[PDB]
Each structure stands twice: as structure tokens, then as C-alpha cells.
Write a protein that binds this DNA or RNA. Structure first.
Ligand SMILES: [K+]
Ligand SMILES: [K+]
Ligand SMILES: [K+]
Ligand SMILES: [K+]
Ligand SMILES: [K+]
Ligand SMILES: [Mg+2]
Ligand SMILES: [Mg+2]
Ligand SMILES: [Mg+2]
Ligand SMILES: [Mg+2]
Ligand SMILES: [Mg+2]
Ligand SMILES: [Mg+2]
Ligand SMILES: [Mg+2]
Ligand SMILES: [Mg+2]
Ligand SMILES: [Mg+2]
Ligand SMILES: [Mg+2]
Ligand SMILES: [Mg+2]
Ligand SMILES: [Mg+2]
Ligand SMILES: [Mg+2]
Ligand SMILES: [Mg+2]
Ligand SMILES: [Mg+2]
Ligand SMILES: [Mg+2]
Ligand SMILES: [Mg+2]
Ligand SMILES: [Mg+2]
Ligand SMILES: [Mg+2]
Ligand SMILES: [Mg+2]
Ligand SMILES: [Mg+2]
Ligand SMILES: [Mg+2]
Ligand SMILES: [Mg+2]
Ligand SMILES: [Mg+2]
Ligand SMILES: [Mg+2]
Ligand SMILES: [Mg+2]
Ligand SMILES: [Mg+2]
Ligand SMILES: [Mg+2]
Ligand SMILES: [Mg+2]
Ligand SMILES: [Mg+2]
Ligand SMILES: [Mg+2]
Ligand SMILES: [Mg+2]
Ligand SMILES: [Zn+2]
Lengths: 118, 127, 80, 24, 60, 98, 155, 206
RNA sequence: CCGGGCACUCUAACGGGACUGCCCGCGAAAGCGGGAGGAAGGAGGGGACGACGUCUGGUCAGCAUGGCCCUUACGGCCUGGGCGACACACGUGCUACAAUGCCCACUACAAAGCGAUGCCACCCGGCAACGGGGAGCUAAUCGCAAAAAGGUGGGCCCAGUUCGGAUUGGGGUCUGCAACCCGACCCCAUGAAGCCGGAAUCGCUAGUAAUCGCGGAUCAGCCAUGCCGCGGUGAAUACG
């Protein structure tokens, strides 16, 4: 059902379902299903109400998820820029922060390609 | 009592020992179909026997090393034919038109400098 | 996702300089050619000139700047 | 695919070991 | 191969990693084979001269 | 029970010296099990032909180390007579253990 | 082939039906040099041809191939400052090649989820005279003879 | 830009290494450097004697150094003191304390390095290059030598434009593996620049 | 694995073998078509090998070298930065866009190579990178080591997803005096474009193409998806 915030996964394996949770990838879902003692293979519609309550219990507060996660990331970047770090400048200009070549590629960061005269 | 042949394909060798019997085949201590089977070409290894209508006459003890399992299949195919020839030399007359006793000289072509693999040339633009 | 190791690296050129200032006071600035050195708490409140390869830039340092190298605050390249 | 660090084939292609490609 | 850079040979590089290899013959920096201590050019030259024992042209 | 390993860049000198050692140890000693070939150790060097660019030229070289075995049974003291030092070959290197 | 006549490749017989045509189809099915998977696909398909059609899959297959074979086809030619589509006959080898290739293509154009099913269904359809392969054959035989006027460019 | 080195081409058959010894991977480069320093010091000394080749062999901490020279009377010296001085400089270079041999070269005109050296000398003395080449080939051919070739490089006659002067005769079958051709190379340092000199001598076949 | 033995496999030196030699047909001959025997025929397959010369082709920055020029600097030492800049354009490649597929588990066959301030079996800690301990190996005898595609079983069910892993946040490991500019690797979270590509254009004729892994040189480490090699599986088509 409704787990860790406003998102409800449905009608497919519970692990893969938990993937639809923001702060939760494959590994964290595997772990959660393990410590919650739930068979992963069961469809979400087949989840016992009890199992759902237990899953919620674990997942909601162990790791920081969803909104608080996004706010944490945003605050991290904000901190990076405020102090006037190089990383912060790269975030500012919207260029690769991880030290990759910008002469070519780096399109993912720079988005669409804006062409001028030669 | 026992009839031997070797045979070779594509960097693979197989000892073939023909010992008259029920017709069951041993490969490296495993059953013939436990090594193969999941390999469709497998039965081709036994083609020489079926050609002379031998089959359930001889059993066979085989030892294969080198290559992948297909080349092994072919090396077995030769070895059985050779052992079969050592048994009855007249069998050659039957076995030759099919060419089972022909060794397949095809091998991996050595990679060459300037190319990618041995043939394949790096592509170009010119514009 | 950065890393160094245990036994964090700080160049001992200014490592002694900063605490030598701290002993008798604040005083004024510093000039450092070592940008590879990590920022440690004892430097908070000081001002360090970092060589970007051309000139020395007057970096003021606060509590939230700790753990970064000096050179992160001294950009080498000039662009647009 | 081979570009996924978190897959068996990814580790193989990258030639490394780890959680997703054990040393047995 | 500038003559001052053949200060390459140093008992005191001041750091192990600062120590780099050169060609013992022509003084080349890049493409220097560890086994011969030579560079690739000098290697092919001396090879063709027959002054490298056991070294033969390869084909297969 | 005397370990011998002959190594050289020339197989002619190796073979000749090995069979020489064998004939030396045959008269003074046991049947001399004789040289076992052992695999070659082949080291290749690929190098561009020209001094500048032209990446597609190459012409690599190889340097091959041939090996030999010996290992005479019945280590007679009479054997080390014709053995010890009598040899022609230069670029042949000898290894000896017990 | 500028110099020689480029002799035809003799393919090994089928491991099951002993038919070289089967083998040819197996090869056209094959992808990235995986023969095993292709044999899997085709034989599974033959297993699908029964309990659908009570007949032997070999017959169905051969007749499908027979129905996909084009009699005529069109080919371009440069004549006096233009480019014409010229109708003309198809050599038996090319008939076979085109028939098989078309069979496989059409099969992989199909909605069916897994391979053997697609091949079995395309084969059956083609056998009874419908499906993408037959559509191709009809399209080509239509293209030629639509161009009848140019048949004097034969060569 | 073609034609690989004939010596280097034939090194396996009908040609042999000048340095013949075995060494490991941790040994080789050092002994090689040493050999190179030996050849180096010997070429800068014995030139006047016309050394056509220097062979170097090793066993254990000992080195052959067989020097092939046109005029051994030069390398020996008066009473043989020169060879003593040379073994001395050799011992000061490498501490291996090794020996030295002198092999007289019969018919200096049949060993290509000596031929090239003579042609080069002539060019440095401002001889006539075309005639020098034709003459050299003549001297090589007139004694044995089933074939011969000499080649001089650019700036012939001090010309502003580089040229190539060819002049060969007999048979020089470079592509034949069994050939046994001697090859040699000399420079010419002139006021106007450098001249390359190549010498091929084809003697016998199988 | 022990005894035991060189028959086989292999290893590496030498040698045999194939020459249109034999048969039919055509031909003046050379030779061509076919057939036999043969492991192989008509150059059996692949390398090395590249004529007289052409491009005033490339390289004085690998080396050599005539001339010209600088010789408190056009030499030399060091710290730092730059060669990694990014509105953009091209070349070469990598990974893909999925079901002839992806994931997990168990399981099977290779060649060529490297290894002592090295490879690192095996034991412990750690999810892992890795750390601690430590056997063997001067290496056909120990190690790198797992080959992968493959097979068996199971999951996914056509969705931008259990496709695809860019980008980014965080926590680490190792090399190295030192990873900010600017390393690689591990783990968690993030999960982009991309649904087979316009005009145009490239390679390849058989163990080839395609596809799958493996090694090595350079190297402390590594931006290697590059290069040079190795083997596994194994096509289509050539009228002309
Ligand atoms: K984008
Ligand atoms: K793929
Ligand atoms: K040949
Ligand atoms: K020129
Ligand atoms: K495509
Ligand atoms: Mg998620
Ligand atoms: Mg950059
Ligand atoms: Mg391959
Ligand atoms: Mg640490
Ligand atoms: Mg994925
Ligand atoms: Mg210089
Ligand atoms: Mg270095
Ligand atoms: Mg270097
Ligand atoms: Mg070439
Ligand atoms: Mg013709
Ligand atoms: Mg179609
Ligand atoms: Mg002149
Ligand atoms: Mg030739
Ligand atoms: Mg020019
Ligand atoms: Mg230029
Ligand atoms: Mg660059
Ligand atoms: Mg710009
Ligand atoms: Mg602007
Ligand atoms: Mg092991
Ligand atoms: Mg453990
Ligand atoms: Mg053993
Ligand atoms: Mg399966
Ligand atoms: Mg399955
Ligand atoms: Mg996804
Ligand atoms: Mg999209
Ligand atoms: Mg889709
Ligand atoms: Mg477009
Ligand atoms: Mg097109
Ligand atoms: Mg071709
Ligand atoms: Mg490396
Ligand atoms: Mg990078
Ligand atoms: Mg690699
Ligand atoms: Zn050099």
C-alpha cells in the first residue's frame, strides 16, 4: 500500500515495487524485505496488511527517504555553492562537477546543443 | 580387443578408444550426453558409426582436451573414423566419400597490425 | 564521494604557521603555494592567500569550509 | 549492460571484482 | 632529448615517483622498453644491426 | 638425481651441448634419460617502423628462450669426470641443483 | 566475383531431417554466430507445427518456402539518361535465398512474443498462402510486370 | 621508404649476431649497455685500422671481444703495447677484466663496412662521387663478389639540391633469403652537410 | 594421488610429404576442365618480404646534421598552474535502445602470455574495494585463474521496465610526498538521453564477417572503451 510518503507501488514483486520509493534502490529493497521477513516474490496486492505495516515500520524510519532526501541533496549543493568552492562553481555554471572533458560530450549536464556560426 | 584413433579439429584433440560392447560412450568420465546435450550438433560426433552401421557394436572411451566443445565434437568425429579404419581397413572405402577421415585445416586467422581483427579494417571518413 | 585515507594529509609549511599565529594571536594573512593541503579547524577565522599559478587569492575561511583543500577556493582557469 | 558497474557483466567488462562479482 | 633532462639519472630524485625512465642510447623519454632500457627506434635500429642477442624478426 | 636446466637463445647450441653432456654421462654412468624439450618462453616486442606518426607500420620482433632437461640417474662420481667443464657453447647457460 | 564463376557453398545436411534447406533456414535464423540458439528456435518451431497441423513440419516448411519463391523481380538499369526498373526472372538459387530471408524477416516482424512461436506461425501462414513473406513475394511479382514495358531492357 | 635492413633481415640464416650471449630479464639490459659502450669506445679508437666488425661474447664475468680489422698492425702497435692500453681502457670501462682478440680481414674490399668507409673518406676529401662509386664497385667486383652495389645520398658535390647516385653491378638479390649479402654504412661529415653511404656485397649463395 | 610405464596427448629439435607425379578428355606447347589415391592438391591457409621511381610527401621534437639566430638569457634549478579550458563543428571508438533479451544460482570446454622490492594459493575481518596473516613458485611442477558467450533451473512479461547506466549527492579502499584543479576502484542513493538513427557513408568473400571472453607491452597509480596479440561460436552472398 502506501509506504514511506505519498507513493504506492502496485501489482508486481514487492522489491521491484519498493524500487518506486525514492530513497530505495534494489539493494535497500532486498535488505528491507529480508529484515521484514517478507518473501520478495509476492505481488503487492497479495501483501498481508500486517506485512505492509511491518514494511512501513522498517522502511519509513531507518533511512531518510523521498522529500527529506531531495531536500538534503539540495541543501548539500546549496552548501557547496555558498562557500564558493570549485565544485560549487561547476554546479553554478551547470558543467560536469566530476572532472570530465567539456570540449566534447558533457551533453547530459549541458542539456540540448546550442549551435552557432563557425 | 581395442582400436585407437586420434583426430583433431581447430586446436582440439580427442583420444578415441573403440572397445566392442553395448554401444554406450564415455567422454572424460562423463556420459556422452552429459558432456553435450544442450549442444544440438553433438550427434554428428557419432556420424561415422551410423555410416558403417556400427553403432551398438563398439563402446567408446574418449578423452578430449583443447578448443571449445564443437571442435571437440569434430575431433571426436575424426577419431572414431580413424579407430574404425584401424579395426577394418576396408572401411576406408566406405568412409572416404563422406570424408570423415579428412582433417579440417581451418584455424583462427592470426590478427594483423593496422587492422582490427585480421581482416576488419578501421573505418574512415575522408569528410 | 571523495576519499583520502586515515592519517589525513596537511602540508607542514603552513601547518606550523597557523598555530604559530594562534599562539600569540590572529595577525594578518599568509601566503601559500601549497593548495594540496587539507583545511583543518585550527585555520578557521584566518585568511590564506592561495597561489592559482598566477597570483595569490585572499581566501577567508569559515567553519563550513573544513575538509576541503585550499585550491578548491582558488580557481586556476579564467573563463568568459 | 556491460556499462553497469553494479552487474556481473559490468564487473567482468571493467575487469574488477566486488559485491556483484565475488571471488568465490 | 635535451642534455639537461639527462639529469634523469639521479641518486637523489627527492621522490621515488619523480624518477622516470629514458632511452639509454638516444635519450628518448616516451616509448622506452624496460627489458632493453632502450626506446623503440633505437630498439629497431640495433635489432636490425644484430647487436641484440637472440632478437629475431617474428612471423607466424 | 641431479637437476639440470639448459637455457639459450639458440636451439642448435643447446641441443648440441645437451647431447654432448649425454654422451659424456653414458660411458661413465647410467642410461642417461636424455634431454626433454620443455616449452619455449617467447617474448614479443611490437614497435612502429617510423620515427614519426605512421601508426599502422609496426614490424614486431620476438626473443625466444629454449629449454632443455638432462637429469642423469645414478650420480656416479666417475660421471663428473667427463662432466664438470668440457664444452663448446657460449650463449648456453647451465643450471644445476641436487 | 570478377574473375571466377563463384561456386555455390555446400551446406552440411540437417542433424534431424537431413535436409540442407533446413540448415540454410537455421543459418538465416542465426544471429551473432549463435547456432545452438537458432537450432533451438527452429526445432521448437517444428514442435509447434504439430498439435496445430497434424502433418509433418518438414512438409509445411518446404511448401511455405515454395510459396514465398518469387518468379520475377525488378532491377535498376541506366539507359540513355534515366534509371529504369526492369522486370526479369529470378534464378532458382536467388529464389531460395530470397524466400528464406523473407521468411525470417517476416517472422521477426510478428506480434508473437517468443521466437519459435513467431517462426512456426509465419511458416504455417506462408504455407497456407498468407503472411508478410507472401506479401513480399506478391509485392515483388507485382512490381515486375507492372514494369512490363521495360522488359526489352532485359540483358 | 622501403627495403628493411638486409643484415637484420637475414639474422636467422646466413647471418649471425655480433653480440652472442644469454642473460635473464634482470641482467640483459646491463650487459647490452656494456656491449654498446665497448663498441662505442672501440669505434672511436680503432677506426684508423679499419674495423669491419666487433663481436662480443660472454660466459661468466668474462667477455670475448673479437675485433675484425683490415690492418691488425695498427691495433697491435709497436711491440704490442697498444693492445695493452686498450685492454686497460676496457678494464677501466667495465670492471669485468676481460680479454681481446684481433682477426685480420682478408681482402678489405669484400667487407661492405670497409668499402663504405673508403667511399666516405673519398667524399670527405672532395673526391668525385660518381667515379668514387663506380671505382668502389669495380674494386669489390674484381675480387670474387658475385654482385655489388654502392649508394650515396643527397648534396652530392655540395649541390644545393640533394641527389642520389646509384652505380651498381653484378647481382644484388635483396629479396633472396639465402643470399648472404654483406651490408655496410658510412657517413660523410662535410662543410656543406652530411652524406649517407650504403654498400651491398653479394658473395656466394646457399 | 602412490607404485609403475613412453603407447597416446602434449612439449621442441630433426625429417618425410605434393611434383599436374598417375587416369580420361581439349591443346602445337605452356597449360585448362574433370577423376583417382591422399591429411592436403593445381599458389593447401596465413605471415615476413614491397622493383626503377613518384608525391620539393613526413620527421631538424628520437638520433645525427650544414646554415642562421640567443648566450645575466631563446641556457639552467624549483613551487604552482597549463597540456584536462567550452557557445560550438568533425574523425575514431565504447555502451546501448532489449525477450534470438536482462538478472540470479549451479555447472562445462581454450589459446597465447606475464610473474621476487613480483604473481599472490589458502585462513581471518570486511556487503565490497581492500586490510591482516601466510604456503608455493628462480616457475610444462606455484600463482595470475574466473574464460565468456554455452548448458540446466528459476525470476522478469513488452513497460522506458528487473531495458539502458549518463548525471549527481554521500560514505569509503588503494597507489602515491601529495588525487582541488586532475587517478582508478568499492558500497548506498540518484536512474538522464536513448524505441535502431536525415542527406550521406564504412568494413568484410570463410574459419572470413558477426559475436564472446583472455593476455601483454607502457606503468607507482591510471583516465585502456586505445593498441598489439590469443583462443571460443560461427554465418550470408558473388548473376555478372
Ligand atoms: K539530456
Ligand atoms: K551485446
Ligand atoms: K605456403
Ligand atoms: K623531398
Ligand atoms: K541498425
Ligand atoms: Mg527509486
Ligand atoms: Mg576538464
Ligand atoms: Mg576471433
Ligand atoms: Mg582513512
Ligand atoms: Mg541495468
Ligand atoms: Mg639535442
Ligand atoms: Mg612515472
Ligand atoms: Mg618513460
Ligand atoms: Mg605496410
Ligand atoms: Mg571473366
Ligand atoms: Mg520484408
Ligand atoms: Mg662529386
Ligand atoms: Mg618475394
Ligand atoms: Mg614541404
Ligand atoms: Mg610540415
Ligand atoms: Mg594531449
Ligand atoms: Mg568558448
Ligand atoms: Mg562569446
Ligand atoms: Mg586456484
Ligand atoms: Mg569472508
Ligand atoms: Mg606436472
Ligand atoms: Mg534458461
Ligand atoms: Mg529461464
Ligand atoms: Mg530501470
Ligand atoms: Mg525519453
Ligand atoms: Mg521497448
Ligand atoms: Mg536528425
Ligand atoms: Mg542509404
Ligand atoms: Mg579478397
Ligand atoms: Mg598497466
Ligand atoms: Mg576522466
Ligand atoms: Mg584489457
Ligand atoms: Zn632511443
Amino acid at each position: 500500500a502506501r509506504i514511506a510518503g505519498v507513493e504506492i507501488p502496485r501489482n508486481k514483486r514487492v522489491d521491484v515495487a519498493l524500487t518506486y520509493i525514492y530513497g530505495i534502490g534494489k539493494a535497500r529493497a532486498k535488505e528491507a524485505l529480508e529484515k521484514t521477513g517478507i518473501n520478495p516474490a509476492t505481488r503487492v496486492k497479495d501483501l498481508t496488511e500486517a506485512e505492509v505495516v511491518r514494511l512501513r515500520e522498517y522502511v519509513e524510519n531507518t533511512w531518510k527517504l523521498e522529500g527529506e532526501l531531495r531536500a538534503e541533496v539540495a541543501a548539500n549543493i546549496k552548501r557547496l555553492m555558498d562557500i564558493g568552492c570549485y565544485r560549487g562553481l561547476r554546479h553554478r555554471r551547470g558543467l560536469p562537477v566530476r572532472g570530465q572533458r567539456t570540449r566534447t560530450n558533457a551533453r547530459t549536464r549541458k542539456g540540448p546543443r546550442k549551435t552557432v556560426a563557425g | 580387443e581395442q582400436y585407437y584413433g586420434t583426430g583433431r579439429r581447430k586446436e582440439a584433440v580427442a583420444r578415441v578408444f573403440l572397445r566392442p560392447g553395448n554401444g554406450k560412450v564415455t567422454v572424460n568420465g562423463q556420459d556422452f550426453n552429459e558432456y553435450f546435450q544442450g549442444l544440438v550438433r553433438a550427434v554428428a560426433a557419432l556420424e561415422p558409426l551410423r555410416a558403417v552401421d556400427a553403432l551398438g557394436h563398439f563402446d567408446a572411451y574418449i578423452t578430449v582436451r583443447g578448443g571449445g566443445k564443437s571442435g571437440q565434437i569434430d575431433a571426436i568425429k575424426l577419431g572414431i573414423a580413424r579407430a574404425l579404419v584401424q579395426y577394418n581397413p576396408d572401411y576406408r572405402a566406405k568412409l572416404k566419400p563422406l570424408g570423415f577421415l579428412t582433417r579440417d585445416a581451418r584455424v583462427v586467422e592470426r590478427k594483423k597490425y593496422g587492422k582490427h581483427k585480421a581482416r576488419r579494417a578501421p573505418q574512415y571518413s575522408k569528410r | 564521494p571523495r576519499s583520502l585515507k586515515k592519517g589525513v594529509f596537511v602540508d607542514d609549511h603552513l601547518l606550523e604557521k597557523v598555530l604559530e599565529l594562534n599562539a600569540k594571536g590572529e595577525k594578518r594573512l599568509i601566503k601559500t603555494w601549497s593548495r594540496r593541503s587539507t583545511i583543518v579547524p585550527e585555520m578557521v577565522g584566518h585568511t590564506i592567500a592561495v597561489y592559482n599559478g598566477k597570483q595569490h587569492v585572499p581566501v577567508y575561511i569559515t567553519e563550513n569550509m573544513v575538509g576541503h583543500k585550499l585550491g578548491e577556493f582558488a580557481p586556476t582557469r579564467t573563463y568568459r | 549492460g556491460k556499462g553497469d558497474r553494479r552487474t556481473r557483466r559490468g564487473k567482468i567488462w571493467r575487469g574488477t571484482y566486488g559485491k556483484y562479482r565475488p571471488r568465490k | 632529448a635535451r642534455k639537461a633532462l639527462i639529469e634523469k639519472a639521479k641518486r637523489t630524485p627527492k621522490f621515488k615517483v619523480r624518477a622516470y625512465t629514458r632511452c639509454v642510447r638516444c635519450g628518448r623519454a616516451r616509448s622506452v622498453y624496460r627489458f632493453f632500457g632502450l626506446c623503440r627506434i633505437c630498439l629497431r635500429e640495433l635489432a636490425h644491426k644484430g647487436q641484440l642477442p637472440g632478437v629475431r624478426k617474428a612471423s607466424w | 638425481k641431479i637437476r639440470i636446466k639448459l637455457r639459450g637463445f639458440d636451439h642448435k647450441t643447446l641441443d648440441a651441448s645437451a647431447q654432448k653432456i649425454v654422451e659424456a654421462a653414458r660411458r661413465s654412468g647410467a642410461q642417461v634419460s636424455g634431454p626433454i624439450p620443455l616449452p619455449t618462453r617467447v617474448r614479443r616486442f611490437t614497435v612502429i617502423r617510423g620515427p614519426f606518426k605512421h601508426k599502422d607500420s609496426r614490424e614486431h620482433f620476438e626473443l625466444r628462450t629454449h629449454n632443455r632437461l638432462v637429469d642423469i640417474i645414478n650420480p656416479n662420481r666417475k660421471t663428473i669426470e667427463q662432466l664438470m667443464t668440457l664444452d663448446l657453447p657460449t650463449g648456453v647457460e647451465i643450471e644445476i641443483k641436487t | 566475383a570478377r574473375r571466377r564463376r563463384a561456386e555455390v557453398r555446400q551446406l552440411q545436411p540437417d542433424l534431424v531431417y537431413g535436409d540442407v534447406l533446413v540448415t540454410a533456414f537455421i543459418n538465416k535464423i542465426m544471429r551473432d554466430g549463435k547456432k545452438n540458439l537458432a537450432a533451438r528456435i527452429f526445432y521448437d518451431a517444428c514442435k509447434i507445427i504439430q498439435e496445430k497441423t497434424g502433418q509433418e513440419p518438414l512438409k509445411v516448411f518446404k511448401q511455405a518456402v515454395e510459396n514465398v519463391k518469387p518468379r520475377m523481380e525488378v532491377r535498376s538499369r541506366r539507359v540513355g539518361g534515366a534509371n529504369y526498373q526492369v522486370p526479369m526472372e529470378v534464378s532458382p538459387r536467388r529464389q531460395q535465398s530470397l524466400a528464406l530471408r523473407w521468411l525470417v524477416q517476416a517472422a521477426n516482424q510478428r506480434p508473437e512474443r517468443r521466437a519459435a512461436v513467431r517462426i512456426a506461425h509465419e511458416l504455417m501462414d506462408a504455407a497456407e498462402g498468407k503472411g508478410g513473406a507472401v506479401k513480399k513475394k506478391e509485392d515483388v511479382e507485382r512490381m515486375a510486370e507492372a514494369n512490363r514495358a521495360y522488359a526489352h531492357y532485359r540483358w | 621508404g622501403n627495403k628493411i635492413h638486409p643484415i637484420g633481415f637475414r639474422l636467422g640464416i646466413t647471418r649471425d649476431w655480433e653480440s652472442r650471449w644469454y642473460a635473464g630479464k634482470k641482467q640483459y639490459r646491463h650487459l647490452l649497455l656494456e656491449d654498446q659502450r665497448i663498441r662505442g669506445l672501440l669505434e672511436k679508437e680503432l677506426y684508423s685500422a679499419g674495423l669491419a666488425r666487433v663481436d662480443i661474447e660472454r660466459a661468466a664475468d668474462n667477455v670475448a671481444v673479437t675485433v675484425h680489422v683490415a690492418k691488425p698492425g695498427v691495433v697491435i702497435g709497436r711491440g704490442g703495447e697498444r693492445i695493452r692500453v686498450l685492454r686497460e681502457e676496457l678494464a677501466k670501462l667495465t670492471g669485468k677484466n676481460v680479454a681481446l682478440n684481433v682477426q685480420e680481414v682478408q681482402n678489405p674490399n669484400l667487407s661492405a663496412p670497409l668499402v663504405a668507409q673508403r667511399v666516405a673518406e673519398q667524399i670527405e676529401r672532395r673526391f668525385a662521387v660518381r667515379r668514387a662509386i663506380k671505382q668502389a664497385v669495380q674494386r669489390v667486383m674484381e675480387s670474387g663478389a658475385k654482385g655489388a652495389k654502392v649508394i650515396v645520398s643527397g648534396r652530392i658535390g655540395g649541390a644545393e639540391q640533394a641527389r642520389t647516385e646509384w652505380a651498381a653491378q653484378g647481382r644484388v638479390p635483396l629479396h633472396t633469403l639465402r643470399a648472404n649479402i654483406d651490408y655496410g654504412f658510412a657517413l660523410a661529415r662535410t662543410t656543406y652537410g652530411v652524406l649517407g653511404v650504403k654498400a651491398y656485397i653479394f658473395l656466394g649463395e646457399v
